[PDB]
Symmetry: D2
């Protein structure tokens, strides 16, 4: 019944989300950067565990690339009911060392992406009277973080987008929500030297452990569900207690 698009859906958190949405019964489409050569290996690996996906290349930072990609998906698969804006990078540098190139890379990939991917899907969801849009932020959007003037600006901006869009289209049966994960067990975090995990990262987390990508995926699946229609404009923290407010 529902068709879901997950940007950056073939790796890390993206992948957990795509798998969970698939297992919830949705038809899942993922997007990947043109530079990523693994979409055929990934679709075969996924077919081997018995999950059928589609996959499209896009540059989420480029408006026309996104309009095109979404047109193809609607042609080939069908109308988008669910969108998870998960694509995003970091270019961590203190403000004193941060240059315009790396400011821009983060704002364009992480926040412009939200406009570029969301605009082409909304009119259909409004026209059918049902939609779910989930913007994947970060605890560092809420809290701030050293070396992340760019990343926290983009991720906090994403929730400003969430709120305004939510107000525009709530009455038509479309929800818009932000999810802000803390530290997860993914390739970037798990490569940290063990002593830094144990003496720097884990002490910041009351739960005393990393989050699993599958846990965050379960929350995204709840928000995309039929009975989550009264939750809109929210920012849901899934962070082990690392930050509360």
């Amino acid at each position: 019944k529902r068709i879901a698009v997950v940007t950056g859906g073939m790796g890390g958190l993206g992948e957990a989300v795509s798998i969970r949405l698939n297992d919830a019964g949705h038809r899942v489409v993922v997007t990947y950067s043109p530079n990523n050569t693994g979409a055929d290996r990934w679709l075969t690996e996924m077919h081997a565990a018995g999950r059928e996906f589609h996959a499209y290349p896009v540059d989420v930072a480029d408006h026309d690339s996104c309009q095109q990609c979404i047109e193809k998906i609607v042609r080939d698969v069908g109308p988008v009911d669910i969108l998870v804006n998960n694509a995003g990078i970091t270019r961590d540098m203190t403000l004193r060392k941060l240059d315009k190139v790396n400011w821009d890379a983060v704002i364009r990939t992480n926040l412009d992406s939200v406009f570029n991917m969301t605009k082409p899907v909304c009119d259909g969801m409004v026209e059918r009277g049902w939609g779910r849009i989930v913007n994947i932020s970060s605890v560092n959007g809420s809290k701030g973080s050293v070396g992340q003037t760019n990343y926290a600006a983009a991720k906090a901006g994403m929730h400003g987008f969430t709120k305004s869009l939510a107000l525009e289209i709530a009455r038509k049966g479309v929800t818009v929500n932000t999810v802000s994960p803390g530290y997860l067990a993914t390739k970037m975090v798990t490569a940290i030297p063990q002593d830094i995990l144990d003496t720097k990262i884990l002490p910041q987390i009351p739960a005393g452990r990393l989050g699993k990508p599958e846990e965050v995926a379960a929350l995204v699946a709840y928000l995309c569900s039929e009975e989550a229609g009264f939750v809109t404009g929210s920012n849901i923290a899934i962070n082990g207690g690392q930050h509360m407010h």
Copy 2:
């Protein structure tokens, strides 16, 4: 497998929560005020739709009454894995007309209740390394509301409790979360003259409709689930967009 206690579990939101938790597979125990004569009619109605509950009388405002009630439940049913602090009243009056009697009734029933019900269950959850505590607040805790200096103080206080407890026991596998519903279709809200619903209440809600108690129950069930262990110290808004922050 899990045993859940829902205060005020036999009516309004309480009941939706108890039903949903039952249908999720939990063994559900409800509490009711000694003044409520309907526990036998309710348990029969519930048995008729095929749900097995237990029900205990308690005064959530009284510490010893709660310790006793929880002892009986542990004796008769077994150890408490899940607690939903849902009991709560309103005594709405502007501060200028509000007297100490009605200030107290709300603070004692709505906030002291959280201490009184939660304290006797925590040591077991910590000892087994698993627990879920869900505190049911209100959008008026976040936003404030005219005539609710007492109610918003109690409901905002509940989330202060949530945060501190969450920090104390996160490392032992126990989560503590607040849920803040907006306007729901329950007997108090549905009795409002139709014109007031249409010209005063609904215009405050971007979704353009009341929430269902079952919707809030679905969110509580998500928080009590096995895969919601990385969400703790949160306050999740389920309000149709009525308030965002």
Copy 3:
């Protein structure tokens, strides 16, 4: 012109506030617990420093005690234009060890006090079309703290109260705001071993120092000023960057 009441005004943060408001041109009245035998000492000290204050015994936990104190202040000094609810205590214990006595002491002194002290002064403020109420909270109300389910509940509750009352009387030229301080250099904190200050306290504060009570008092003075009339229902953090949201 303005007459200000500062509960707990003879010591710690309350002192700094009383001093600052005096020096801003207000006539300052303080309250103290009837079992505090330091009033003559504090007045003598203040007089030798050139400041004139009135000091009245009150039990802020007791509604009639507060009502009678304010009536006396209105007879002997004049109508109250400014109230700063600064009185409050701690009784820190984890929930597993916290007894009802110590839950209650903190809820009644810290939260019931806002109702007890604020109710007898609001009508006047409203009738004259001008007033300032400032509720002194804590960073621990925003973030929670181990050992402070009682304190965080009371201090978060205070801000619930702030919001609801602000909505009730904003139209009449009365403002109500919360101030949430972090770690301050009061006698209590500056008596923490230097060692614990360096390894446990200061690392929580990006500013790398304790706040001065004078600095918090400058903020209260700002909120009590004639030009702060458009700030209402807010919770202003003054914590050296210890918590942000």
Copy 4:
């Protein structure tokens, strides 16, 4: 002693800020868009009112434009101690109708500007151990607004930036804070038909009036003061009670 830069300083809120900081004893420099031909008129007016300012053309959306402007200000006037990022625009359109041009105009002018203007002044502030950065947001960043997915994204983004930068430099005596105004009596708003003010704007504001630009400027002056050094990473609401959280 202190040298202050106020972007957008010749009109509206920026004007009130520039005036207030001047009157607080600071040496105030303003910036304006190079296509604004009003600088001589504004200086003449200010001079006749007894205030002396310097005004420099800048494109806040352009990184090199801002870097060269600050270098000129440092040569002709002196090192910048205070920066108020007040410049910003609106291009209101619902997402369904919003084009990339108008997304971009607002992200670049409102959000990239904080990076462009703040980066060239931070090192100085850090080297001397004193600085104040104030980012002017909006109530619509906190709450979202119909037609403002772009504006809310930029203004919420600004506060993301505030938090991360505050964490980076708090240890060096530099503060970074956001101020979020509600409806203000600027030329634009006071030109809304009286009719729309009464039925559409004022009912959103518990205070029952528009804010004065002077009132917001008094808050900025407070944050820029010597005694506000322990306030950092905050977002202070000045909205007549329009939004609370």
